[PDB]
């Protein structure tokens, strides 16, 4: 198949490995998650436009809307834990080990 498909898959894999290995902050995890969504957007849009599937052109808009609502919920959770601890570090979310 095509080449830009390979580049978008590799971009998605890079963002997934970024999400799956936290460094210090929760915001970097959210950024990696939203980059994953952006790669999904580009891949689906290219496939739908190249395939001339007319009625599938509405799908990336719904995908963008739902994942941005997801991101709003995640930002609210990040703000709540930052108000609790004074920072958004992932090492402070360890009370539930016990």
């Amino acid at each position: 198949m095509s080449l830009v498909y390979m580049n978008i898959m590799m971009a998605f894999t890079v963002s997934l490995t970024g999400l799956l290995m936290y460094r210090s902050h929760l915001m970097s995890s959210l950024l990696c998650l939203e980059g994953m969504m952006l790669s999904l957007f580009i891949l689906a849009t290219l496939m739908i436009l190249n395939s001339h599937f007319t009625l599938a052109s509405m799908m990336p808009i719904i995908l963008l809307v739902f994942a941005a609502c997801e991101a709003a919920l995640g930002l609210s959770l990040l703000v709540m834990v930052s108000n609790t601890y004074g920072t958004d570090y992932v090492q402070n979310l360890n009370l539930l080990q016990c």
Binding site: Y5, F12, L16, L19, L20, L26, S29, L33, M36, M37, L40, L43, A44, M47, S51, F53, M59, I62, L63, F66, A67, C69, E70, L73, G74, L77, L78, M80, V81, T84, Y85, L93, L95, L96, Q97
Partner: protein, 347 residues
């Protein structure tokens, strides 16, 4: 929390589950999943303490990762098939990604690390809602795509889930963590029998739902969240001790109780396909679940732990909790074995 807002949010959770169940489009499956998760997040954060926000954060991160993997599998399937009908998949990579996404959503091992912490951090009612209702939609999606599921992957996930759940539940003293590890082992059983006869999976799902609902309803009726606070129940209401004894015996699969029927029919199905080592291993491993159930029954019903002075003050007042459907699911989770051929209604 407003009663009306709570009502709207609960109907939104059920609406998301219904949208997943009834739809023939992959995008609608995805939409129902996000609607369900977005609506169920405030049920977890009903009490507004740091543990609930931590549990909600971990749950949100896990479900978002699983959802992105599911969308990846859907887009790969569209690329290699040009359609969106919810049926067998046309790519092994899409099948593997979707199977692991559904495993992450169900919390099966080795993606099990979020289940006990999330169950511990949230109240008993929201934990009941999670561990009972949240698992109806991924098992339905698995029920729709079984021609594309890799057998080795799903069987590995099943045996890993059963062993890890038993070994994890051996060490816990909190009731919610025990319920979480029990859930992990039961989903191991359910997805073990999935590829041979999914009707057995539906029967096991129904029986596990009823037994978990009974145990959680008894827990919120007595307002107990630890082992010792449950052990205080003999000096307050001994009928509840009898009920938790029979329900925990039935949860361990001991005949002639109704919990024996799912693993009995699962072993019956697995031996028809010349698989004998796996059902024996799963039974021997489920002995561990029986072990910590029997430890709970020792601490609660078959011995009298010392109580305190204020239990008299608690004697002078009756209970007023709405123990909804508690006798019905108490009866249905113990004396249902003579009605075993009723499983033909699920085919």
């Amino acid at each position: 929390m407003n009663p009306i807002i709570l009502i709207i949010i609960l109907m939104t959770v059920m609406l998301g589950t219904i949208i997943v169940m009834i739809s023939t489009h992959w995008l609608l499956i995805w939409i129902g999943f996000e609607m369900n998760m977005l609506a169920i997040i405030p049920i977890m954060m009903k009490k507004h303490n740091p543990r609930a926000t931590e549990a909600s954060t971990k749950y949100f991160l896990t479900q978002s990762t699983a959802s992105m993997l599911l969308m990846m599998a859907i887009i790969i399937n569209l690329m290699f098939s040009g359609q969106w009908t919810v049926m067998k998949l046309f790519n092994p990579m899409a099948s593997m990604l979707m199977t692991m996404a559904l495993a992450m959503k169900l919390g099966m091992a080795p993606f099990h690390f979020w289940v006990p912490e999330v169950t511990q951090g949230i109240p008993l009612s929201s934990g009941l809602i999670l561990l009972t209702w949240q698992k109806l939609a991924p098992m339905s999606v698995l029920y729709q795509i079984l021609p594309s599921i890799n057998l080795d992957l799903i069987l590995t996930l099943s045996i890993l889930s059963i062993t890890i759940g038993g070994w994890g539940g051996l060490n816990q003293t909190q009731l919610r963590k025990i319920m979480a590890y029990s859930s992990i082992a039961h989903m191991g059983w359910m997805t073990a029998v999935l590829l041979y006869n999914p009707t057995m999976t539906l029967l096991n799902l129904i029986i596990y739902i009823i037994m978990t609902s009974t145990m959680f309803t008894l827990f919120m009726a007595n307002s107990t969240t630890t082992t010792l606070s449950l052990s205080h129940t003999w000096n307050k209401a001994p009928i509840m001790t009898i009920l938790v004894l029979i329900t925990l015996l039935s949860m361990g699969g001991l005949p002639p109780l109704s919990g024996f029927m799912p693993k009995w029919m699962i072993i019956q199905e697995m031996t028809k396909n010349d698989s004998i080592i796996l059902p024996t291993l799963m039974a021997i491993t489920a002995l561990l679940n029986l072990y910590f159930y029997m430890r709970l029954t020792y601490s609660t019903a078959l011995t009298m732990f010392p109580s305190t002075n204020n239990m008299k003050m608690k004697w002078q007042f009756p209970t007023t909790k709405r123990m909804t459907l508690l006798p019905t699911m108490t009866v249905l989770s113990t004396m249902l074995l003579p009605l075993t051929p009723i499983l033909s209604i699920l085919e």
